[PDB]
Amino acid sequence: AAVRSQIEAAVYKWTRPRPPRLGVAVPRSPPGTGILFHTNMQTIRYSLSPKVWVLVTGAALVGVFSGQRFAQTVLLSKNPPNPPRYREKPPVRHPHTPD
Amino acid sequence: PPTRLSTPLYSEGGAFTVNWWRNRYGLYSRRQTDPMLAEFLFRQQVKEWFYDVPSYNYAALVGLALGILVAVIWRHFLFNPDVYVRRQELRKMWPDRHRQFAYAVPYLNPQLKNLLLPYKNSFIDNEPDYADYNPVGLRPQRVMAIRRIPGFFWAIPQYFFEDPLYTSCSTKNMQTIYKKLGYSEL
Amino acid sequence: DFPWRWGFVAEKPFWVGAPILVLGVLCLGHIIQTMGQIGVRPKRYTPEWVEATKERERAENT
Amino acid sequence: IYEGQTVQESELIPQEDDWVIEETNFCLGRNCYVRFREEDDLARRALHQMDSQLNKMHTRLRDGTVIPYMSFHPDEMVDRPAPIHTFSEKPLLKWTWDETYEEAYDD
Amino acid sequence: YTPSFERGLNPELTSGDYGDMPKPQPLIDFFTQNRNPWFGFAMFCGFNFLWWAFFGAWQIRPLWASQRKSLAEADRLYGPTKYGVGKKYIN
Amino acid sequence: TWTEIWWEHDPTPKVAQYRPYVCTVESGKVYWWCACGESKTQPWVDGHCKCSKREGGFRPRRWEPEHDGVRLFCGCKSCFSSPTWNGGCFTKWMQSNPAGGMLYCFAAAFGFGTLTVYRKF
Amino acid sequence: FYILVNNNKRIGIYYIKLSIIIGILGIVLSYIIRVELYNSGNRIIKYDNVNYYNMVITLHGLLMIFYIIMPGLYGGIPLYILPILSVITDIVLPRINNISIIIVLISYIVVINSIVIEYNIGTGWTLYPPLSIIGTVIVNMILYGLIIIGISSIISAINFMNILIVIDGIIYVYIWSIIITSVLLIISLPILNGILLMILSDIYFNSIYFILNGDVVLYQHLFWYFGHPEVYILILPAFGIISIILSVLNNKIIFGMKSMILAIIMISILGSIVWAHHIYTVGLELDTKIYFNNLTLIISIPTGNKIYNWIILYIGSYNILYNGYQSLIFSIMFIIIFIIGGITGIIISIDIIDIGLHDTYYIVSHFHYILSIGAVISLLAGILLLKDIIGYYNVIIKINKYFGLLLFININIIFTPQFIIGFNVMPRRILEYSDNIIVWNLISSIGSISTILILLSIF
Amino acid sequence: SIFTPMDWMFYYFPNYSRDKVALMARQIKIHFAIGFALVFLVYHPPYKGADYGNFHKSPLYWYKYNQLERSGQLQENLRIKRDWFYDEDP
Amino acid sequence: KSYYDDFKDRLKPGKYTQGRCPQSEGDYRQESKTIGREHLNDDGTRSKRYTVKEADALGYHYHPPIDKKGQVYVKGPNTVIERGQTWIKGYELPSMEYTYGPKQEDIPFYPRVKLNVWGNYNLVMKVEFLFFYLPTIIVFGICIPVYTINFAQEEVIYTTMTVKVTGRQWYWVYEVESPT
Ligand code: HEA
Ligand code: HEA
Ligand SMILES: CCCCCCCC/C=C/CCCCCCCC(=O)OC[C@H](COP(=O)(O)OCCN)OC(=O)CCCCCCC/C=C/CCCCCCCC
Numbered sequence A: 001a002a003v004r005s006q007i008e009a010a011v012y013k014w015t016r017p018r019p020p021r022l023g024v025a026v027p028r029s030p031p032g033t034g035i036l037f038h039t040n041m042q043t044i045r046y047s048l049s050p051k052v053w054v055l056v057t058g059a060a061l062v063g064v065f066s067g068q069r070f071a072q073t074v075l076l077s078k079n080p081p082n083p084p085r086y087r088e089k090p091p092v093r094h095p096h097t098p099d
Numbered sequence B: 001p002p003t004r005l006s007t008p009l010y011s012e013g014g015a016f017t018v019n020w021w022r023n024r025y026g027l028y029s030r031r032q033t034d035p036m037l038a039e040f041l042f043r044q045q046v047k048e049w050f051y052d053v054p055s056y057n058y059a060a061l062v063g064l065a066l067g068i069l070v071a072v073i074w075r076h077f078l079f080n081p082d083v084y085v086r087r088q089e090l091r092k093m094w095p096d097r098h099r100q101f102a103y104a105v106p107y108l109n110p111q112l113k114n115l116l117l118p119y120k121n122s123f124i125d126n127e128p129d130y131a132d133y134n135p136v137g138l139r140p141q142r143v144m145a146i147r148r149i150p151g152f153f154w155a156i157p158q159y160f161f162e163d164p165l166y167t168s169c170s171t172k173n174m175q176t177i178y179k180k181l182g183y184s185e186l
Numbered sequence C: 001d002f003p004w005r006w007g008f009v010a011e012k013p014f015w016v017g018a019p020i021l022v023l024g025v026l027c028l029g030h031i032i033q034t035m036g037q038i039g040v041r042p043k044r045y046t047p048e049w050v051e052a053t054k055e056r057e058r059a060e061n062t
Numbered sequence D: 001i002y003e004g005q006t007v008q009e010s011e012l013i014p015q016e017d018d019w020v021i022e023e024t025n026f027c028l029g030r031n032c033y034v035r036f037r038e039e040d041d042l043a044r045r046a047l048h049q050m051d052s053q054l055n056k057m058h059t060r061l062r063d064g065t066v067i068p069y070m071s072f073h074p075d076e077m078v079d080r081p082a083p084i085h086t087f088s089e090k091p092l093l094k095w096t097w098d099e100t101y102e103e104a105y106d107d
Numbered sequence E: 001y002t003p004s005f006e007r008g009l010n011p012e013l014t015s016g017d018y019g020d021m022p023k024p025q026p027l028i029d030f031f032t033q034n035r036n037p038w039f040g041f042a043m044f045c046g047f048n049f050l051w052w053a054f055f056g057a058w059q060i061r062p063l064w065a066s067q068r069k070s071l072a073e074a075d076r077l078y079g080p081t082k083y084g085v086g087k088k089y090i091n
Numbered sequence F: 001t002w003t004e005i006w007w008e009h010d011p012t013p014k015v016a017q018y019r020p021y022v023c024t025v026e027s028g029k030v031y032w033w034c035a036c037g038e039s040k041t042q043p044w045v046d047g048h049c050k051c052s053k054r055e056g057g058f059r060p061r062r063w064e065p066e067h068d069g070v071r072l073f074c075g076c077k078s079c080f081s082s083p084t085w086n087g088g089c090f091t092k093w094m095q096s097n098p099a100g101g102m103l104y105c106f107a108a109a110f111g112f113g114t115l116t117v118y119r120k121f
Numbered sequence G: 001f002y003i004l005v006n007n008n009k010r011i012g013i014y015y016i017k018l019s020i021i022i023g024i025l026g027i028v029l030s031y032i033i034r035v036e037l038y039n040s041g042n043r044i045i046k047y048d049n050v051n052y053y054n055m056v057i058t059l060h061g062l063l064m065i066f067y068i069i070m071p072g073l074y075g076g077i078p079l080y081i082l083p084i085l086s087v088i089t090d091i092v093l094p095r096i097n098n099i100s101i102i103i104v105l106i107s108y109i110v111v112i113n114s115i116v117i118e119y120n121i122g123t124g125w126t127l128y129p130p131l132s133i134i135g136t137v138i139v140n141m142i143l144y145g146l147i148i149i150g151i152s153s154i155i156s157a158i159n160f161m162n163i164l165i166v167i168d169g170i171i172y173v174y175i176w177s178i179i180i181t182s183v184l185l186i187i188s189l190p191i192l193n194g195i196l197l198m199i200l201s202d203i204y205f206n207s208i209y210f211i212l213n214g215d216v217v218l219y220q221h222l223f224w225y226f227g228h229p230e231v232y233i234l235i236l237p238a239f240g241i242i243s244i245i246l247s248v249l250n251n252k253i254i255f256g257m258k259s260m261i262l263a264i265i266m267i268s269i270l271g272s273i274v275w276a277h278h279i280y281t282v283g284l285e286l287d288t289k290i291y292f293n294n295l296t297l298i299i300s301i302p303t304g305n306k307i308y309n310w311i312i313l314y315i316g317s318y319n320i321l322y323n324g325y326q327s328l329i330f331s332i333m334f335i336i337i338f339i340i341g342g343i344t345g346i347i348i349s350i351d352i353i354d355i356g357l358h359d360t361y362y363i364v365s366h367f368h369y370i371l372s373i374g375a376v377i378s379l380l381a382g383i384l385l386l387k388d389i390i391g392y393y394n395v396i397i398k399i400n401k402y403f404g405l406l407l408f409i410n411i412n413i414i415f416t417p418q419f420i421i422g423f424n425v426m427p428r429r430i431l432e433y434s435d436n437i438i439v440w441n442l443i444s445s446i447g448s449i450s451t452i453l454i455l456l457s458i459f
Numbered sequence H: 001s002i003f004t005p006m007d008w009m010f011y012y013f014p015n016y017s018r019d020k021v022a023l024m025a026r027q028i029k030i031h032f033a034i035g036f037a038l039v040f041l042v043y044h045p046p047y048k049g050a051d052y053g054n055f056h057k058s059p060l061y062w063y064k065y066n067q068l069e070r071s072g073q074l075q076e077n078l079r080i081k082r083d084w085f086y087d088e089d090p
Numbered sequence I: 001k002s003y004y005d006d007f008k009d010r011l012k013p014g015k016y017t018q019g020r021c022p023q024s025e026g027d028y029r030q031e032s033k034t035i036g037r038e039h040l041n042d043d044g045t046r047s048k049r050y051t052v053k054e055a056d057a058l059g060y061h062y063h064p065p066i067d068k069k070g071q072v073y074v075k076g077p078n079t080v081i082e083r084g085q086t087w088i089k090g091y092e093l094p095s096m097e098y099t100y101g102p103k104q105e106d107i108p109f110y111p112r113v114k115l116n117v118w119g120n121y122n123l124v125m126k127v128e129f130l131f132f133y134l135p136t137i138i139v140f141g142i143c144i145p146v147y148t149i150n151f152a153q154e155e156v157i158y159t160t161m162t163v164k165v166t167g168r169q170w171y172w173v174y175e176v177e178s179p180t
C-alpha cells in the first residue's frame, strides 16, 4: 500500500498538464477576468490531457495483447499430429450405378 | 489571398494561369456586369477553389486516372494483335495475316507479367509452381518468388525460407509422392 | 392526438417494448410462412433418403 | 477554414466589473401540431398558419436588437407548408468588401 | 419494489432532505429496472433473439431430437469416415 | 480539461462522486440536477448549493424523462451527456488518478482480448 | 386543376406520390420472390409457370430502379427544393416539368398493362440478348417503356442544368449533386437509346446484330456504359440529401464543402469509365481486365472522403438536442449501411474474387444494401426533413424509434444471409435450389414478411 | 507534388506556388505523365522482367537468412518433411 | 403538470366520421349561397367553378388588379414618432399558446452559442490529407495483388487434354477426344 501510494503520487505529479500551445490566433483574456458564462451552456466534452491519454491508451494496448497471449497459451490448445493415413478400401460400387 | 481589389494578383504566363482563367471565367456570366463586381466575383471563386488545400488531392487523382486511361486506349490500338485499324490484313483469310501475327508474341509477354507471376506463391498453399514449366517456349519459364508480396500478406512469413512446410508442398515433392505410387505423371 | 394503438405502445419504455416487438414480428413471419406447408412431407427428407445421401458422400468423398 | 470572427483583447474589456454573459433563452417556446379552430374557414385557417411560422420568430437582446431564426439554406425561409409563389422579392445574399466610394459620404 | 437508499462514495452529499425528490439507489436496480417483470421478460426476449441471430433459436431442438438421432446414425454408419473430434459433428 | 487548462471563464464544478447516482424517475415530472457538486441531496439541487443560489455561474440543470424507469445520473458533474451519465465519471477519475486509470484499462482490455481471442482463435 | 398544374413544388409531390404507388407493385413482387425462395419445391409458382418468376424478377428490378427510386430521388425531392435552394421563383422550364411526370405515369401504365395482356416471360432487368430478342411481345412493351422513360429523364436533366443560368445564390453541395447527375444522364442516355434501338431492330426489323458473326458482348458494353453511371445517378442525389440533413440537424457547417463537391465530380468521371467490371466473366483481354479493376478500386478514394466528412459533421454536436428524430437516425444509418455495401463492392471489384461471386446472391445483397436500404432510407430521411415544408400528415413517422429499429433489424435479416449463400453458392435469377441452402434462404424470407408488416404501422 | 500536403507546398515554396491556377495545372500534368509512363514503361516493355536469377535480396532478407543459417533452422526448414503418401499400418 | 389540460376546452371531440355529415343530410358539394362566398363550397372548400371550370388563368373573369398609375394597395408600417425620431414598431407574432395550444411556461433553457467550428487549421489540413490518402494507400496495397492474380488466370499452360462444352436450352453438351 505504501508503494501503491508512492507510484500513484509519482504518476500523478508527472502527468499534470501544462498550458496548451494554442494552434489558433486568439486574444489574451483581459487581466482580472473571472467566470462570465454559466453552467447552462452547451456541455463541452471533458478530454484527458495528452500524457494521461497516452498512458491509459497504452495500458489498454498492453492489456489486449497480453490477454490475447493468455488465451493462446492457456485457454487454447495446439493441433496434435494428424492421424496416420493408412490405405483403406473404397466402396465397391457407386450407390447410383445401374445394376 | 488579397482582400483588397487594389492589390494585384500574380499570374504566370501560359495557357493555365490566373490571367488565362480571368479572361474565360466570365464569358458566360450574367453576374459580372462591371469591373469592380467582376473582379470581386472572380477572386471569390479563385479563393474558394484554388486556395483550398484538399482540392489539389483530387487534381492528382484525375490526372493519374486519365493518364492511365489514355495510355490503355492507345496501347490497344498500337499493339493489341486483335485490334485492326488498317485493312490490308482484314482483306485476307486468317492464315495469311502475317503482319498482324507479328504483334502476338511481343504482346503476350509484357514486363509486369514477367515481374509479378513469380509471386503466385503468396496466394497458393499447395503446388504454387504447378504451372511453372512449359516446354513450348512462348513464355519464359517461371521461378517462384523468394519473398511475400509487400502489403497485406501477414498470414504468410515475410520470406519463404522461413516457412517450414514450403518445400514439401512444391509440385516437385508432390510429383515424387504420386510417382512413387504410380498414380500420375505430374 | 394519436389513436389507441400508438398511445398504448408509446406509453411503455422503449427497451421494454422494442425487444418484445422484434421477437413478435419475427415469430409472426415464420407462422405465416408455415401455414401453407402444414403436413407436407417430402420423401427426400425421410431417414431412408438421408442415409442414401451419406452413402453417396462416402463414395464421392464430398 | 472558418474559425469564428477575430477578436482583439481591447474588445474583451468590460465597462463594468459586474458584466457577465446575458442569460436569454433562445428556445422559442413549446410547440406541437398547429391547432386550427373548427369555426375558422379556409381563409381564416390560412391566416392562422401564417401566424405560427417559426422562421418569423426572433429573440430580442438587452440592447433591443433581435437575433432571428436563421438557417444554412433558404429552404427554411419559405412559409410552412410552402406556398405556390415563394420568393416574389428576390432574396438578397449580402456580400461584404472593403471597397468604398466618395459619393456615399458627406463632410 | 421499495428500493434501498445508497449513500454513495461521499455520504455527506446525500445527507440532505430529499422530500419528494427520489433518493439514490443501488446499481442492481438499474439493471433490473426496479425488478419490473416486463423488463425481465424483455431482457429474456433480448437474449432469445440474439441467440437466434448468432447460433439459431435452439428452441427447435426438443422437436428435432429424434431427427438429429437419425442423422447421427446415418453419418456414422454410411457417411465418410470422421477422425478424432470430427466425429462430434454431423451434417 | 477544458476548464482546467484551456478556458478560465466557465464555472468549474466540484466532483461529488466519481460514480453515477442511480435514481427512479417518472415521466411527466421535472427534475433539477446539481451542477456544482456541493448539494447534499445529490444528484438533485437541495436549495442551498451554488446552483440554487445562482452563484458563480452555477444554475440548476433542467431534466425530464420520456418514460418511467431507473436512470443513471452524473456525479462527476462533467459528463458530456449531463445530467445523464455516459461514462464521463470514469474518464474524469482517470485524469485525477492516472495510475488507477491504467490499472482498470489494462484489466478491461485484458478481459476483452482473452474473450475475443478465445472465441475466434 | 390537377393534371394541368405546372407548379414545380406540386410536381415534386406528384413524383413522390407516384413512386409510392408504383413502389407497392415493386414490394409485392419482392414478397413473391422471397415467398417462393422460402424452401425448395414449388410454393406459390407452378413448375409449368416458371416463366412468371423470370418476369417477376425482371419487373421488380426495372420498376424499382427506373420507376421508383429514380423518380423519387431525382424527380421528387429535386423538383421541390432545388428552385428554393437556388433562391429562384420557380423551375426554368415549367411546361417541360409537367410533361415529364405525365410521361413517367404513361410508361408505367404500359408496363403493367403488358403484364396483364401479354404472355409473362422474363430476361432480367439487364435484357441480355439473344434471350431478350427471342422472347415474346412483352419484351417489346418493356422496351417502349424504357425508351419513354429515357425521354422523361433527359428532359428533366436539361431542366436542372438550366438552373446554372438563373441561380441567384450559392451552388450548395446538394445542387452540385443534382447537376452532376444531370450531366451523367446527358452523356449516358444517348448511348443507351442506341443499344435499345438495336435490340428493337433485332426484335422487330429482322436485324442480325445479335446472331452469329455479330458479337452479343457488344450489347453488354453499351448497356453497362449506361448501367454503371445509372447506379451513381441513383446514389448521388442521396449523397446530396445526407449532406443537408447532417449539417442542418447538427447545426454544423459542412466541412470540406469543396472536397465534397470535387468528390462528387470525381465519382462521376470515374463512374463513366469503369463499366466493364460487370463483364469480368465474359473473357475480356488481360490488360482490359486490369485497367477496369484498377479504375474501379480508385472510385473508393473520392467516395471515402465523403464518408469521413459526414462523420465529423455528426461528431461534436450539442447533446441537449434530441437525437431520436427519424430523419437524423436515417441519415446516420445511411453511413453505417453504405460502408457495408461499398466494401462488398470493393471485394467483388477484384476480378478473381468476382469469378466466384458473379451471378450469385452476394451481388444481390451488395446492391440491396446500397439501394434497398441506403437509397430508400435517404429518400425517407429527406422527405422527413421536409415534412413541415411539404405539409403531409396522417402518419406516425417523424418520431418513431420502433419503426427505425424494426426496419434496420429486419432489412439486415433479409440481405446479410444473402452474402453467406454467395459462397455456398446459390446463383441469382433462380427459383429452385439445393436443399442445403434452405436455412439461409428461409431466414431471409422471414425477414421479408416482417419488413412488410412494419410498413403498415406508419399509418 | 506526389503524396504532398499542399499546405506544406504553399509554405516552403511560396514563389513556386504564387499562381495557384498554374499550380493546379502542374498537379494535373505531373500525375497525368506519371500514369502514362507507368503503362508504357512498367507494364508494356516486352520480353523484360524475366531475370529470376536477379531477385532482389534486401538487407532484411540477409539478416533473417543468416540468423537461421547460423542455427539449424534453415536446414530444417528446407528439409522435405514427407515424401510418401501412406503411413505403414502395424 | 399536464399541458394538454390547459387547452382541453378548445378541442371538442368530433361527431362525424371525417368531419362531414352524409351528403343527403347536407350537400357540401354545392356552392355556398352566402354573399361574398361565391368562390367557396358550403363546407368551405374552394368550388370547382372557381378553380377549374372558370379559372381566371384561362381568361374567365378578367379583372386587372393594377390601376391607371401602376399602383396596388400596400399596407403601411406602424409608425410612432418619438424623441425627435420616426420609429417603426415591428409586428410580433401571437403567443405560441394561441396558435399551438401549450402554455408558454417552464421553457427549457437553450443558450445562445456561436457555430461549433473545427479549429487548428494545420491539424485539420493533415486530417483531410489522411481522409484522402489513407484510402489511396489501401488501394495501392491491393493493386499489386490484383495484377498478380490476373496474370495467373491468363497464363500459357502446357495443357494436354481438351474438353469442349456447349450450353444449350436447357442442357450442357460435352465433346471429348475418344481413346484410340
Ligand atoms: C447505387 C447502387 C450502387 C453503388 C453505389 C455501387 C457501388 C459500387 N459497386 Fe456496384 N452494383 C450495383 C449497384 C451499386 N454499386 C448493382 C445494382 C449491381 C448489379 C447489377 C447487375 O449485375 O444486374 C452492382 C454490381 C457491381 C459489381 C458486379 C459484380 C458481379 O457482377 O459479379 C461490381 C464489381 O465490380 C460492383 C462494384 C462496385 C464498386 C466497386 C462500388 C463503389 O462505388 C463502392 C465505393 C464505396 C466504398 C468503397 C465504401 C466507402 C469508402 C470508404 C469506406 C473508403 C475506404 C475504403 C476503401 C479504401 C476500399 N458493383
Ligand atoms: C432500388 C431498387 C430495389 C429495391 C428497393 C429492392 C427492394 C427489395 N428487393 Fe430487390 N432487386 C432490385 C432492386 C431493388 N430491390 C434489382 C435491380 C434486382 C435484380 C433484378 C434481376 O435479377 O433481374 C433485385 C433483385 C431482388 C431479388 C432477386 C430475385 C432473383 O433475381 O433471383 C430479391 C429476392 O431475393 C429481391 C428482394 C428485394 C426485397 C425483399 C426488397 C425490399 O422489399 C426490402 C424491404 C424494403 C422495403 C419494403 C422498403 C422499400 C420502399 C420503397 C422502395 C418505396 C420508397 C418510396 C419513398 C421513400 C417515397 N430483390
Ligand atoms: C484533315 C486532312 C486529311 C486527313 C485524312 C485522314 C484519313 C484517315 C483517318 C483515319 C482515322 C484516324 C487515325 C489514322 C491512323 C493512321 C495510322 C494507322 O493506320 O494507324 C494504325 C494503328 C493500328 O493499326 P494496325 O496495324 O492495323 O493494328 C496493329 C495491332 N494493334 O491505329 C492507330 O494508331 C489509329 C487508331 C487510333 C487513333 C487515336 C489514337 C489512339 C489513342 C486514343 C485515345 C483516346 C482517349 C483520349 C485521348 C486524349 C488525348 C491524349
Ligand SMILES: [O-][O-]
Pocket (backbone or CB within 6 Å): G227, G228, G231
Ligand atoms: O454497378 O456498380
Ligand SMILES: [Cu+2]
Pocket (backbone or CB within 6 Å): G227, G228, G231, G274, G275, G277, G278
Ligand atoms: Cu457497375
Ligand SMILES: [K+]
Pocket (backbone or CB within 6 Å): G036, G037, G038, G039, G040, G041, G042, G043, G431, G432, G433
Ligand atoms: K422454391
Ligand SMILES: [Zn+2]
Pocket (backbone or CB within 6 Å): F034, F035, F036, F037, F038, F039, F045, F049, F050, F051, F052, F058
Ligand atoms: Zn449545485
Ligand SMILES: [Zn+2]
Pocket (backbone or CB within 6 Å): F074, F075, F076, F077, F078, F079, F085, F087, F088, F089, F090
Ligand atoms: Zn459524470
